[PDB]
Amino acid sequence: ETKCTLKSFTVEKGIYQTSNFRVQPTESIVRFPNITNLCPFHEVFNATTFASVYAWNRKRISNCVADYSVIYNFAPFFAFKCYGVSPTKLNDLCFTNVYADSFVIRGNEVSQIAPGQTGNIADYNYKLPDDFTGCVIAWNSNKLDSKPSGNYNYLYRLFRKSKLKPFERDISTEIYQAGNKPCNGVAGPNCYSPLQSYGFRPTYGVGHQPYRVVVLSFELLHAPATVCGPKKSTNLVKNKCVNFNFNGLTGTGVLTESNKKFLPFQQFGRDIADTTDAVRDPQTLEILDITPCSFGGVSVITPGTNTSNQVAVLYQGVNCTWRVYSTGSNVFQTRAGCLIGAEYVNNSYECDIPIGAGICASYQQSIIAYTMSLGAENSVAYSNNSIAIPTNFTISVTTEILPVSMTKTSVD
Amino acid sequence: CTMYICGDSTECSNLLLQYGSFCTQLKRALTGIAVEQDKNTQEVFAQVKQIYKTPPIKYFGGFNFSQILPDPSKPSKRSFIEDLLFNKVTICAQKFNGLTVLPPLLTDEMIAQYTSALLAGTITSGWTFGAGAALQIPFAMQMAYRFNGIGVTQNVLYENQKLIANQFNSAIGKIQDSLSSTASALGKLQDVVNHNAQALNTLVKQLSSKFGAISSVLNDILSRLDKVEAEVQIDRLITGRLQSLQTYVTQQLIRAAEIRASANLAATKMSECVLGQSKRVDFCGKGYHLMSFPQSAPHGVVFLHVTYVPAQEKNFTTA
Amino acid sequence: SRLDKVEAEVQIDRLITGRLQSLQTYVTQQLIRAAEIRASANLAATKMSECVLGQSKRVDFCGKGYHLMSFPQSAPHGVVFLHVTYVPAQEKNFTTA
Amino acid sequence: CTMYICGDSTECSNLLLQYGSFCTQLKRALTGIAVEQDKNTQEVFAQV
Amino acid sequence: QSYTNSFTRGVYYPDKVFRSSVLHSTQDLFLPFFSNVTWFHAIHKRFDNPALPFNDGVYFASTEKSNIIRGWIFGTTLDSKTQSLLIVNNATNVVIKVCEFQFCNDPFLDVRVYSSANNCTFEYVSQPFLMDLEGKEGNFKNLREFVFKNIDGYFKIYSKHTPINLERDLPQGFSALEPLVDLPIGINITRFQTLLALHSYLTPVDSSSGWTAGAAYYVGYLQPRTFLLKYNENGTITDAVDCALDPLS
Numbered sequence A: 001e002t003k004c005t006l007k008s009f010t011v012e013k014g015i016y017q018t019s020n021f022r023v024q025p026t027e028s029i030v031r032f033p034n035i036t037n038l039c040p041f042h043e044v045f046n047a048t049t050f051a052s053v054y055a056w057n058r059k060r061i062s063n064c065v066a067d068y069s070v071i072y073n074f075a076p077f078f079a080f081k082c083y084g085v086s087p088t089k090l091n092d093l094c095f096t097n098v099y100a101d102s103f104v105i106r107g108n109e110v111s112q113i114a115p116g117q118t119g120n121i122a123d124y125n126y127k128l129p130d131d132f133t134g135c136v137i138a139w140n141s142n143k144l145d146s147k148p149s150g151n152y153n154y155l156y157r158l159f160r161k162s163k164l165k166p167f168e169r170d171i172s173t174e175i176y177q178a179g180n181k182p183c184n185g186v187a188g189p190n191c192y193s194p195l196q197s198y199g200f201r202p203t204y205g206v207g208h209q210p211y212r213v214v215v216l217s218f219e220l221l222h223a224p225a226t227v228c229g230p231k232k233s234t235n236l237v238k239n240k241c242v243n244f245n246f247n248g249l250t251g252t253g254v255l256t257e258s259n260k261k262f263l264p265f266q267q268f269g270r271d272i273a274d275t276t277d278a279v280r281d282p283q284t285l286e287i288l289d290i291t292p293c294s295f296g297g298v299s300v301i302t303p304g305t306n307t308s309n310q311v312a313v314l315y316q317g318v319n320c321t322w323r324v325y326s327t328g329s330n331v332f333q334t335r336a337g338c339l340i341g342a343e344y345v346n347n348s349y350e351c352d353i354p355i356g357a358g359i360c361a362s363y364q365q366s367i368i369a370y371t372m373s374l375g376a377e378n379s380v381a382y383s384n385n386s387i388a389i390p391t392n393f394t395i396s397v398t399t400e401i402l403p404v405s406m407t408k409t410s411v412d
Numbered sequence B: 001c002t003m004y005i006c007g008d009s010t011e012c013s014n015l016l017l018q019y020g021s022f023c024t025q026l027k028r029a030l031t032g033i034a035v036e037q038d039k040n041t042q043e044v045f046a047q048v049k050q051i052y053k054t055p056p057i058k059y060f061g062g063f064n065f066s067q068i069l070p071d072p073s074k075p076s077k078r079s080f081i082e083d084l085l086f087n088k089v090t091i092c093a094q095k096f097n098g099l100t101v102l103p104p105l106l107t108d109e110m111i112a113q114y115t116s117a118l119l120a121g122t123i124t125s126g127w128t129f130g131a132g133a134a135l136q137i138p139f140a141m142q143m144a145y146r147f148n149g150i151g152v153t154q155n156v157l158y159e160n161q162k163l164i165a166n167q168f169n170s171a172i173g174k175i176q177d178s179l180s181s182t183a184s185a186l187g188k189l190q191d192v193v194n195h196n197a198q199a200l201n202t203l204v205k206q207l208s209s210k211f212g213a214i215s216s217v218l219n220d221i222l223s224r225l226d227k228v229e230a231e232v233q234i235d236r237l238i239t240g241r242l243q244s245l246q247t248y249v250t251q252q253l254i255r256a257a258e259i260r261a262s263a264n265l266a267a268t269k270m271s272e273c274v275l276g277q278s279k280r281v282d283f284c285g286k287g288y289h290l291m292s293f294p295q296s297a298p299h300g301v302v303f304l305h306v307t308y309v310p311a312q313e314k315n316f317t318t319a
Numbered sequence C: 001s002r003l004d005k006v007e008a009e010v011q012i013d014r015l016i017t018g019r020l021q022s023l024q025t026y027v028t029q030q031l032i033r034a035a036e037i038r039a040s041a042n043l044a045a046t047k048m049s050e051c052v053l054g055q056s057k058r059v060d061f062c063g064k065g066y067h068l069m070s071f072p073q074s075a076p077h078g079v080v081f082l083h084v085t086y087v088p089a090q091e092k093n094f095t096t097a
Numbered sequence D: 001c002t003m004y005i006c007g008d009s010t011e012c013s014n015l016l017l018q019y020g021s022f023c024t025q026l027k028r029a030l031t032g033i034a035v036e037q038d039k040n041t042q043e044v045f046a047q048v
Numbered sequence E: 001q002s003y004t005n006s007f008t009r010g011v012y013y014p015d016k017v018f019r020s021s022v023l024h025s026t027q028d029l030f031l032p033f034f035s036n037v038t039w040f041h042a043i044h045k046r047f048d049n050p051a052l053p054f055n056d057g058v059y060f061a062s063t064e065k066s067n068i069i070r071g072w073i074f075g076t077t078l079d080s081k082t083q084s085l086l087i088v089n090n091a092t093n094v095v096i097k098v099c100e101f102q103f104c105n106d107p108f109l110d111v112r113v114y115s116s117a118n119n120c121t122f123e124y125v126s127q128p129f130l131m132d133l134e135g136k137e138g139n140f141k142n143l144r145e146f147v148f149k150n151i152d153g154y155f156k157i158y159s160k161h162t163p164i165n166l167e168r169d170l171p172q173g174f175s176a177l178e179p180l181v182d183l184p185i186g187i188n189i190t191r192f193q194t195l196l197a198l199h200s201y202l203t204p205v206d207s208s209s210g211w212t213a214g215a216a217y218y219v220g221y222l223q224p225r226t227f228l229l230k231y232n233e234n235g236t237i238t239d240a241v242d243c244a245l246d247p248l249s
Ligand SMILES: *[C@@H]1O[C@H](CO)[C@@H](O)[C@H](O)[C@H]1NC(C)=O
Pocket: A042, A046, A047, A048
């Protein structure tokens, strides 16, 4: 591994770095609140003739537990476009509040439910949030809403004067006042009333059929949980590196018993790092501290490849005294970290390959680690009337290499 | 690399491979800083390698060096000043996002032994322990050889060596209170400690950033967006997160250059303030410099410069 | 040769940013090293101007031991100093006064 | 920070907040050099 | 009516997270420090109907023994034309009715509230907000603090029953107002009032003429400002500092 990092077949000596320890998780526990009541999504799906686009039927779905099978009860799905959330994974995630809206429109207006566009619906009549964290569900219902006599009973406010803000009701008298004269609603001309009859008969073009369009809107990253697909509430574990799922947000780490306080309405544990580290049990009142599994950092100690091949491995900040999969010849517990593959000694020698915290390794036919030898212990005989005067010299010559300049470079 | 930029997601690490070779330069730069910060303390302290020991009877003249000599009473062998300095100078949240702190090679037990070595040599062998083999020399006689370096004759010390001992000892007794009077003196070291601490803190907080994406967290965006549209949100998350790391490493590079510039000054000052007696003005204290005594400190060194300043002047007529 | 104008720009532009950022990083790192290489080069000039042209009374600057003189030697992208120093060797002790 | 990146537009300043804490470290960086450049003249000239 | 200053009131938990001995800065609706809190007639005899506008939240504080103040009205027009909100703190169970009632100029549930318009889209039953009543202590015992915020169709109210014995207007101290219930409806609020409770006890004799337009509740408003606060090791909010006050702040 060290050779691969260095991009060479010979490594000289010293410490080296590789990928971290990365203790793998054992399994995943997914704890859900406790609510088992069936949520009535069929009411907003296949009721009687729904209202037109001029007056939507907004609903507030909450406190229930719901899944994605009852939505899949309907085959003729046409406008299955899903925004924000992928359709295949609308399960096992907890929203905070889901708003369901229903209306009936024609074929040429189905594509108008997309945000950031101008159309018949997207004009003054209806406005929708251009971020649109939710999704759109629609299917053909030309066999039910359509009538042989002609469904002229549905209107639509196309010609209203002012624009519209997203998520705003538009149901009013809407007198028409346009042109360079006050019509007052009686004059006659320039009335062009916005309301008009759709015209729904079972003999028409493909792009002019009635549909049941239900749009869903919601948001995420909220402490309370409202509605999510069922998942078996497996018993929790302690001190085991496990994946977890607590009403939405997931993560990997060990769970520890309560040591903090929290408040009756308080259930999160965000810290200065702004990462969740203390959560409450969704089922009962248990405070759990979330400390993700201990990261590593693997360091390889090697003498010369031209000298030997045996190596030693160092894990910085990882205790062993411990969850290290398989062990080796020996295990040491330096303050720097966990060292394996090297044999500690009792002597002291000059440092040649650094390890940390006053310890270095060396190659004796084996790799040995030791403390520091600062130098030979010398005691100088200091006396009130004693002096030592030299009687001979030694004219030595020493080098000293200092860089002066580096190669000049240019670019274009 | 990925541990900081992303999580346990292979797709995010796959998208980081598009950048490809940004890690190898980033990890190399920080390792170069650490390996040279580790070496940086070597020449400042390990100026002499003979580990001298003070004589059992600490009679270095009438001078009182108990305030600077290591005391065996403490579990860690340190002087009166060093223990005061240890207490006068004062994490996990960083250590789950990718950051670590490699321990220094030289612990304080050996660092204090290095200072004890120099201190023993600067007292028993005076300034000889920096030129060759140490040669003992009485401390009363050593002073008369430091006065001569300032154009003051031998006998000036000897007729009032009792006053010299009474006065240097009094000054060394006061330096404990003066250093303990306020914490403004240690501001040169507490500056480097919290500045690195706040540099790490401002790096951890940068992960919780809405860098043009729907959310800062990584796991949720996988469960939210499909492949054809999740990348356009996660890519701008990678660019910003990489930029924050790139900014941090550069700021460390300037700081590392500045720290070693001061460390070289300390090494040069350690190499002649105590190993000798400099004729340079103000380099080794204020006034005519006599000697100095090193004292270790967290992430730094402290020098107790001993100088000679005239005080009582009577003006005469000359020719 | 592959993409048309309206959609080739969206790809080359991010290639432009990455190639420019790599150049910015290289130049920035050169600035720190160039400042550092001058820091030692100023020390070499000071050492050359004082160890070689004179005998420095400061200790440990012009070698190890009591310094006598120095002889400069050239080297690729650097300089080498041969510090000739005087160190004592044979130490008989005596009683003093 | 904002005055330089954007004019008197609130929407631009709201955009800057998405980065959050990028300008903070810029002001602190310029304050450190400025406070140290006034300290250079002190130790060069106020020696007596 | 009368004007009174609120010193360090209107501080509440802005989110549902827990922090220990840290300092957190947040930006949202907050009652500014040292603001003009409208203190109404400090008697009770008295029966007034002040037109109170609702805008950007309302801080409501009013100590009162025997819980004479029980009701609460919200809305914009209150003539069965648009949606409205109602609270009854029936002192063993709280009833919340977001409906379209009719309401008189001088409402009074005891010795005549709506008499018509009784159909809507909300029913609620929970533990009453007020604690217990019939406290005839000579000195003041408890103080009530309430904050309402109608945003994102997520009508939130916060409460805080605290014991005070100082008998002089608002206590001078920081209060850790705590959220208790969230009501997602989505309504338009611009005006609000409240209701009292008192029995003549007999219809023939002196039915209703004893009252003048002088009915005492503190009303404060909220402004969007940054109010970096401080936590302790238990997690209860200790002190908060306003970032728009004097430059020392
Ligand atoms: C709606 O769907 C349910 C699901 O089975 C069915 O029982 C019911 O009859 C349907 N109602 C109408 C009006 O189609």
